[PDB]
């Protein structure tokens, strides 16, 4: 809060009354010259005097400066000034809305020069990003059609900002945006995930993540526009900033039904997910494991595809060494994968072969009650298989119980009989009596 910024605040509030009377002049150069001053001070990189401007009361006269009939330089300078206000606080953005700027920004998307369009589409993103009411209001003002036309230019900064704004118009669930209006952007988004500007790419994928975060209807239309093949490809992009929204978008598709999940499987999502298990970003490692558990609950054919993609060994390695936030996801994936077991014996013994047992028993100590049960679920399924092989071959010891004892796992299972949760108590009671009961 420098001495420089302070002498400007003092110089502004003596000159602001003059500034307001110049902007209300009848002369045209004067109006333009006053509007430029406001645009400039409102552009101050750090702490632009937005509340001071707003309390000068020029917002409705700036808005009128955008009208269908004003000279084009005045339209730009006002639009730019109002955009710096709309890109501030929620409260400051409300000032621009309540002054009726939104339907004018939209007309400027039809009639404006390219520089004017980029100010206007940035202003509307900031409105739309602020509230579900404001984004619905923008859509109700029929903004979608002029917004999609902006992608027919080849001015890169313009599409980039337009893609950011489109993403805000598609965002938000607590009321879901009017699908009839927002689905019109899918063809355009399907092209935009093939763009070469990183930032466009990021925001195109964020927009699809929001569009795919809803009903089967929305998820189906994402598939029909054959977006998924490119989302899976984008999982292998350089930047984690691309990877994250692409991963969330496909994650939304895998939580659809089994046919929706098969699309992205056929797309090669499992190979990409294997590599994301080694991302440097911990969030990506966590979301990858979450996505993978979502499919290890499903078809036994899907469990098998997960196993075939060599996903199990890195999952076990994350179960062993990762932060608990990630371990709990890998646990879900492993224990879903053991589901069944009975039916498909070869899966369990393969997972045992990859060193599943010790990391499973180890988490029993540090985990919450919910992850306790999924861990005991996995361990019960492993032990079940161990007894079945023992009877079918007649060997009178359970190899998987024997491997649990070797891992120091008995006492960790047996310590969970101390849990007041009756239902892990009963699972822990169930295994040690069934499998660790002989003297």
Experimental method: X-ray
Q: Which residue, among 128, 26, 46, 87, has the nearest Cα to 79 in the 3D structure?
A: 87
CATH label of the domain that carries residue 339: 1.25.10.10
Residue in the block written with tokens 């009361």:
57
In three state form, how does the secondary structure of the chain look?
CCHHHHHHHHHHHHHHHHHHHHHCCCCHHHHHHHHHHHHHHCCCCCCCCHHHHHCCCCHHHHHHCCCCCCCHHHHHHHHHHHHHHHCCCHHHHHHHHHCCHHHHHHHHHHHCCHHHHHHHHHHHHHHHCCCHHHHHHHHHCCCHHHHHHHHHCCCHHHHHHHHHHHHHHHCCCCCCCCHHHHHHHHHHHHHHCCCCCHHHHHHHHHHHHHHCCCCHHHHHHHHHCCCHHHHHHHCCCCCHHHHHHHHHHHHHHHCCCHHHHHHHHHCCHHHHHHHHCCCCCHHHHHHHHHHHHHHHCCCHHHHHHHHHCCCHHHHHHHHHHCCHHHHHHHHHHHHHHCCCCCCCHHHHHHHHHCCCHHHHHHHHHHCCHHHHHHHHHHHHHHHHHHHHHHHHHCCCCCHHHHHHHHCCCHHHHHHHHHCCCHHHHHHHHHHHHHHCCCC
CB distance 229 to 267 below 8 Å:
yes
Q: Which residue, among 350, 260, 253, 344, has the nearest Cα to 307 in the 3D structure?
A: 350
Q: How many domains does the chain have?
A: 1
Sign of CA dihedral 83, 87, 88, 91: positive
- The encoded tokens of residue 228 equal 């998924």
Number of residues in the chain: 439
Query: Dihedrals φ, ψ of 74, to 5°?
Result: -70, -40
CB distance 339 to 381 below 8 Å:
yes
Resolution (A): 2.3
- How many CB atoms within 10 Å of residue 233? 15
Task: State the Cα angle at 156 between 154 and 159, rounded to 5°.
Answer: 85
Structural domain harbouring 251: 3-436
């Amino acid at each position: 809060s420098s001495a420089a910024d302070q002498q400007f605040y003092g110089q502004l509030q003596q000159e602001l009354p003059q500034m307001v009377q110049q902007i209300n002049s009848s002369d045209m150069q004067e109006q333009l010259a006053a509007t430029v001053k406001f645009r400039q001070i409102l552009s101050r990189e750090h702490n632009p005097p937005i509340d001071i401007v707003i309390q000068s009361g020029v917002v409705p006269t700036l808005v009128n400066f955008m009208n269908e009939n004003q000279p084009e330089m005045l339209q730009l300078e006002a639009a730019w000034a109002l955009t710096n206000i709309a890109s501030g606080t929620s409260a400051q953005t409300q000032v621009v809305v309540d002054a009726g700027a939104v339907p004018l920004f939209i007309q400027l998307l039809y009639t404006g020069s390219v520089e004017l369009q980029e100010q206007a589409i940035w202003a509307l993103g900031n409105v739309a990003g602020d509230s579900t009411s404001y984004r619905d209001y923008v859509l109700q003002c029929s903004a979608m059609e002029p917004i999609l036309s902006l992608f027919n230019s080849e001015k890169v900064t313009l599409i980039r900002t337009a893609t950011w704004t489109l993403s805000n118009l598609c965002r938000g669930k607590k009321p879901q945006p009017d699908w009839s209006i927002v689905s019109k952007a899918l063809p355009t988004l399907a092209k935009l995930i093939y763009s070469f500007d990183n930032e466009t790419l990021i925001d195109a994928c964020w927009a699809i993540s929001y569009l795919s975060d809803g009903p089967a209807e929305a998820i189906q239309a994402v598939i029909d526009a054959r977006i998924p093949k490119r989302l899976v490809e984008l999982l292998s992009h350089q930047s984690t900033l691309v990877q994250t929204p692409a991963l969330r978008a496909v994650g939304n598709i895998v939580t659809g039904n089994d046919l929706h999940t098969q699309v992205v499987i056929n797309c090669g999502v499992l190979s990409a997910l294997r590599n994301l298990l080694s991302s440097p970003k911990e969030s990506i490692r966590k979301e990858a494991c979450w996505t993978i558990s979502n499919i290890t609950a499903g078809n036994t054919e899907q469990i098998q595809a997960v196993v075939d993609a060599n996903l199990i060994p890195p999952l076990i390695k994350l179960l062993e060494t990762a932060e608990y936030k990630i371990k709990k996801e890998a646990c879900w994936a492993i224990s879903n994968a053991s589901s069944g077991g009975l039916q498909r014996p070869e899966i369990i013994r393969y997972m045992v072969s990859q060193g599943c047992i010790k990391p499973l028993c180890d988490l029993l100590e540090i985990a919450d009650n919910r992850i306790i049960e999924v861990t005991l679920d996995a361990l019960e399924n492993i032990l079940k298989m161990g007894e079945t092989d023992k009877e079918a071959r007649g060997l009178a010891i359970n190899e998987n119980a024997d491997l649990i004892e070797k891992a120091g796992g008995m006492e960790k299972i047996f310590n969970c009989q101390q849990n007041e949760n009756d239902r892990i108590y009963e699972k822990a009671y169930k295994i040690i009596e069934t499998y660790f009961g002989e003297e």
